[PDB]
């Protein structure tokens, strides 16, 4: 096309589908998967962290609840990526309720 690549967004798009297949196989206590997606994914400088933007299709009050269910499910997600991604350990999959907002990291 007309724009840069740098092996960033392509890799994040590879991780994007992985997390969705994992979600379809998560089963969960009560996550209405029909009312969510994982759209934006952005990995860190040294790819040691992986920021996953979760867009719930409920109210914002409900949307918050889903993030703790996701953060419980972290190990199930991250182990699946360690099947596919040839590296020793995998990034910290930090789930967020779709918050691209420049100020913080923590």
From Swiss-Prot:
Its main location: cytoplasm. GO terms for biological process: maturation of SSU-rRNA; ribosome biogenesis. One of its GO terms (cellular component) is cytosol. Belongs to the RbfA family. It is found in: Cytoplasm. The chain holds residues 1 to 105 of 131 of the full protein. It comes from Thermotoga maritima (strain ATCC 43589 / DSM 3109 / JCM 10099 / NBRC 100826 / MSB8). GO terms for molecular function: ribosomal small subunit binding. Keywords: Cytoplasm, Ribosome biogenesis. Monomer. Binds 30S ribosomal subunits, but not 50S ribosomal subunits or 70S ribosomes. The gene is rbfA. This is Ribosome-binding factor A. Transmembrane segments: none annotated. One of several proteins that assist in the late maturation steps of the functional core of the 30S ribosomal subunit. Associates with free 30S ribosomal subunits (but not with 30S subunits that are part of 70S ribosomes or polysomes). Required for efficient processing of 16S rRNA. May interact with the 5'-terminal helix region of 16S rRNA.
